[PDB]
């Protein structure tokens, strides 16, 4: 090597850089820096509107965690009246 001025004028810099908003990652799921969403409440399926739907709803999905448990109807087998068809 051989140096002329000055290892730098303006020193090392933007090569790690993050600073005001060191953001990416902690953020991104800056959908969900706060996975905030819906109602507060309540009636039904929420997941509005974006997100969607409710797809199969109640205890399902939601799990997720919907919530709650309900006097149901508690999933278990048989029903859903396998409404297909």
């Amino acid at each position: 090597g051989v140096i002329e001025e000055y290892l730098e004028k303006s020193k090392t810099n933007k090569e790690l850089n993050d600073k005001k908003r060191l953001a990416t990652t902690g953020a991104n799921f800056a959908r969900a820096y706060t996975v905030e969403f819906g109602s507060c409440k309540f009636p039904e399926n929420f997941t509005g509107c974006q997100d969607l739907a409710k797809q199969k709803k109640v205890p399902f999905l939601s799990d997720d965690l919907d919530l709650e448990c309900e006097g149901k109807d508690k999933y278990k087998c048989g029903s859903n009246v396998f409404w297909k068809w």
């Binding site: 051989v2 140096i3 000055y6 290892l7």
Partner: protein, 176 residues
């Protein structure tokens, strides 16, 4: 059930050790010393920026005319006089042996109490950190590895490549 191997010179391995490793002192503190931003800057114009190069391999010659000299004088009269022939005292010689060096010749000796005893106390000091230096430099010579491998962009060689997150090198710390 356990090896057959205390190399009798189990006694000598230990003294290129105090060689190797005390020695790595020279690199350990002057490096990170360096002097972050001294104020700052590393610039060496002087014998070096106009007289057609300075060193490289006149480097070595002069450079280790002395290491030359001194490293030789180092083990080859560490001690051992008597210095020839012909039956066993083991190390692979002590064919100095029972005679240190001279029967009433000169002052072969250092120090009173007919030996060489640099006195009794000083196990302290260099048992500890020093055969430390052996140990120490094992792992910040295991940093030599970490400190640079990855050939900072400027070259992938034999292209596996083989994944890709982000770079690596040195300066202290770590993302984590």
């Amino acid at each position: 059930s356990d090896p057959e191997s205390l190399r009798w010179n189990v006694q000598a391995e230990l003294v290129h050790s105090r060689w190797a490793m005390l020695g790595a002192a020279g690199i350990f503190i002057p490096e990170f010393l360096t002097k972050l931003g001294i104020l700052n800057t590393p610039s060496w114009y002087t014998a070096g920026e106009q007289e057609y190069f300075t060193d490289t391999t006149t480097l070595f010659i002069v450079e280790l005319v002395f290491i030359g000299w001194a490293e030789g004088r180092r083990w080859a009269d560490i001690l051992n006089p008597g210095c020839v022939n012909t039956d066993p005292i083991f190390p692979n010689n002590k064919l100095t042996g029972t005679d240190v060096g001279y029967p009433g010749g000169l002052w072969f000796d250092p120090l009173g109490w007919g030996s060489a005893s640099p006195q009794k106390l000083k196990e302290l000091r260099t048992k500890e950190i020093k055969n430390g230096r052996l140990a120490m430099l094992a792992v910040m010579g295991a940093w030599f590895q970490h400190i640079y491998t990855g050939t900072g962009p400027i070259d992938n060689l034999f292209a596996a490549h083989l994944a890709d997150p982000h770079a690596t090198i040195f300066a202290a710390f770590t993302p984590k």
